[PDB]
Design a protein around this ligand. Sequence first.
Ligand SMILES: CCCCCCCCCCCC[N+](C)(C)[O-]
Length: 124
Amino acid sequence: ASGMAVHDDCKLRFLELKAKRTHRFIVYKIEEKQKQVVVEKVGQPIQTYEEFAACLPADECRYAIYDFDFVTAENCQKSKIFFIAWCPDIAKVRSKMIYASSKDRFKRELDGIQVELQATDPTE
Ligand SMILES: CCCCCCCCCCCC[N+](C)(C)[O-]
């Protein structure tokens, strides 16, 4: 009969990424038993796509923030903060609903998101 809370460390890790750009990405997980979103993994300032992808379980949903930077032709570095709702096909329908129904509430704690994505792997 309890709602979905968000552990303080979630915003703190996000704040470091947004303010200091010290983390390439952050992977969040919902602990249903404790009914709270927690930090599962925090990446170094520079991480490959493979290292990030490795952090998204093929059998479970997650939320993630990815600081997607790119270099312009003028050799200028820019970045967009991506919010990602990872929803693999084999995850339990129940878990998918839990992540989906708590998505907006969690996002609300992460001011500064510029692009929102929902991702799945069709190579299940
Ligand atoms: C910043 C780029 C946004 C792309 C996010 C897409 C992440 C997909 C990761 C697939 C995970 C692969 N898997 C299931 C084997 O773990």
